Ligand binder design. Structure first.
Ligand SMILES: O=P(O)(O)OC[C@H]1O[C@](O)(CO)[C@@H](O)[C@@H]1O
Lengths: 325, 287
């Protein structure tokens, strides 16, 4: 089954002027739980802004700040399981606090978040956009999947820098998230097409390249991302179309994983019933509703990783994990 | 015994579009017009006809005719009545394979999508007929053809197919793996279909197929009914040296075996066939 991975449907116990967890961290955790903030980049930006709020309210430092904000990340692991972008952000923040030696260290810390967000989430996105501009030619059609803040940025800037392509947006239940791509494409004027994952093998005959987004690249080259990505890349290879995944460097986790079973958050199963024949699923004892959030595609199904350092073949992501550390 | 070879060469001369095996059938049938020693004479005709052409189709097409007439001798026996039932049954066999290419074209031209881009090997009078029927059904496509050394039959096909107003490209013999992604489907004409459903075609057909399954392009074969030879190769050595050779050292085989796993479908005379289905038909063509 999925026993080790956690099932969740958390702010009732805490006091309204909360003292156990910081106010900003309570807002952040409840926005994670309800779904107001989605996407690995958006979650990392929101986390780092909330941590800047935590540090500017901190009054006394190196050990104290780390063991003070470890319960905050325990709360966030309870509210919505942390993706690896958040994990590396927290690792960098703890290394930054432990690096600060013997007031003025709060301003130097808070700017290091700004020097983290800029040259690893924003400048990295611009560099990945420049690299993926090369792989997008006139007339080809690009299959994207779900919503990615980087994939849609790549498509939009490739369109506004003169390309004339077409996008096919493949989407999955229950998040129905590629609509947030689709609408954002139509505002840019890009021609678009929308369909679900089961119809992917219908349009992979016409698709020229599959351009996906990664929530984490693991230490063997497996791409941990949204649950339809691995299946979509498998059908993409079976129709021999190249698969490109666009991931920043800071999402590279040194965790390694073979199958799509080890670290895969489960959203609440109550999302699954569609308009109903499944509303009373709790009373069926044998029936269990399962929706994964993430799966891993193997590096042999991915032809290219686009990174702010360059374009790498998805078997040399441990190379980048070495040279940045 | 010598006029047989001359007549076979003549059937080549006044009919180039007629297949080699059909030419063998016609000259062997005339030799039939000139008890059980006559079966030995026809076997000698097989040996002398295969000795001068050495294609798989000749030693198979004539070999079914050694069996399509000897099947009637299982029904009844005579001395000159058996010869006349032989000639009225052989004429039926011969006029039943004059309609082969049209049937293959009618089955196969429905497998070409509109706006497709096929890839074909050297020169087939059956692939040419499949495309001729496909443009007569108002389909438009592109044809990639390999020049297919040493005899450059690809240029002969592209000259014979440019009259159909089809965009045809004589791609280099080495560049199958290059243009293979520019191909929707692969249509080749077998020179013989062996017992496992694989084919024996001009050299280079195998690596056309191996690239095809590397990219899951459908590999279609348009053979005929008389090309069903009873061989069972397991590798390229198992093809006999009778068929491979027409005659810093050159090798030059002229045919090579394509495994049945690489073939998507065969559009033979007797219906569209899975590569497995061929084996059944071979059993039925030899009891
Ligand atoms: O279609 P045809 O002319 O009967 O022969 C089919 C195959 O035999 C060859 O003519 C000779 O092997 C090949 O060019 C062709 O692929």
């Amino acid at each position: 089954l999925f026993s080790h991975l956690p099932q969740y449907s958390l702010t009732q116990f805490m006091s309204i002027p909360s003292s156990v967890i910081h106010p900003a961290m309570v807002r952040l955790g409840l926005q994670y739980s309800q779904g107001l903030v989605s996407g690995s980049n958006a979650r990392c930006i929101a986390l780092l802004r909330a941590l800047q709020q935590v540090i500017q309210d901190y009054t006394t430092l190196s050990r104290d700040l780390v063991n003070k904000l470890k319960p905050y990340m325990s709360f966030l692991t309870q509210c919505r399981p942390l993706s690896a972008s958040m994990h590396n952000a927290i690792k960098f923040l703890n290394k930054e606090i432990t690096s600060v030696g013997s007031e003025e260290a709060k301003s130097e810390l808070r700017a290091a978040i700004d020097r983290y967000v800029q040259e690893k989430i924003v400048l990295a996105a611009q560099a990945i956009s420049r690299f993926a501009y090369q792989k997008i030619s006139n007339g080809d059609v690009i299959l994207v999947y779900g919503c990615s803040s980087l994939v849609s940025r790549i498509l939009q800037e490739a369109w506004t820098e003169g390309r004339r392509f077409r996008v096919v947006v493949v989407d999955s239940r229950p998040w129905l998230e590629g609509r947030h791509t689709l609408r954002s494409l139509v505002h840019a004027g890009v021609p678009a097409s929308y369909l679900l994952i089961p119809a992917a093998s219908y349009v992979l005959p016409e698709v020229s390249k599959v351009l996906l987004g990664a929530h984490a690249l693991l230490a063997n080259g497996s791409v941990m991302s949204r649950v339809g990505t691995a299946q979509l890349a498998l059908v993409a290879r079976a129709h021999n179309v190249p698969v490109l995944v666009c991931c920043e460097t800071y999402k590279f986790c040194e965790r390694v994983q073979t199958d799509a079973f080890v670290s895969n958050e489960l959203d609440d199963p109550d999302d699954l019933q569609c308009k109903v024949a499944l509303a009373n699923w709790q009373n069926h004892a044998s029936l269990r509703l399962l929706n994964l959030v993430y799966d891993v595609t193997p590096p042999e199904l991915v032809d290219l990783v686009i990174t702010e350092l360059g374009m790498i073949p998805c078997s040399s992501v441990p190379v980048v994990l070495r040279v940045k550390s | 015994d010598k006029e047989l070879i001359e007549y076979f060469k003549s059937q080549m001369k006044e009919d180039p579009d007629m297949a080699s095996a059909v030419a063998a059938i016609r000259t062997l049938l005339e030799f039939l017009k000139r008890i059980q020693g006559l079966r030995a004479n026809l076997t000698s005709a097989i040996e002398t006809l295969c000795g001068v052409d050495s294609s798989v189709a000749v030693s198979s097409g004539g070999e079914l005719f050694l069996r399509f007439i000897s099947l009637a001798s299982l029904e009844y026996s005579d001395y000159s009545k058996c010869k006349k039932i032989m000639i009225e049954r052989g004429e039926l066999f011969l006029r039943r394979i004059s309609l082969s290419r049209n049937k293959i074209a009618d089955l196969c031209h429905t497998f070409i999508k509109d706006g497709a881009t096929i890839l074909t090997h050297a020169y087939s009078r059956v692939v040419l007929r499949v495309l001729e029927a496909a443009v007569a059904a108002k389909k438009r496509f592109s044809v990639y053809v390999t020049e297919s050394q040493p005899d450059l039959s690809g240029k002969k096909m592209a000259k014979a197919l440019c009259h159909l107003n089809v965009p045809v490209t004589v791609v280099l013999d080495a560049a199958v793996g290059y243009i293979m992604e520019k191909a929707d489907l692969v249509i080749v004409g077998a020179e013989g279909v062996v017992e496992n459903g694989g084919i024996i075609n001009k050299i280079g057909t195998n690596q056309m197929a191996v690239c095809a399954k590397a990219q899951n392009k459908p590999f279609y074969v348009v053979a005929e009914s008389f090309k069903f030879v009873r061989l069972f190769p397991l590798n390229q050595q198992d093809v006999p040296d009778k068929f491979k050779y027409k005659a810093l050292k050159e090798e030059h085989p002229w045919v090579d075996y394509t495994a049945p796993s690489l073939i998507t479908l065969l559009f033979t005379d007797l219906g569209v066939l899975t590569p497995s289905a061929v084996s059944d038909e071979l059993i039925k063509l030899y009891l």
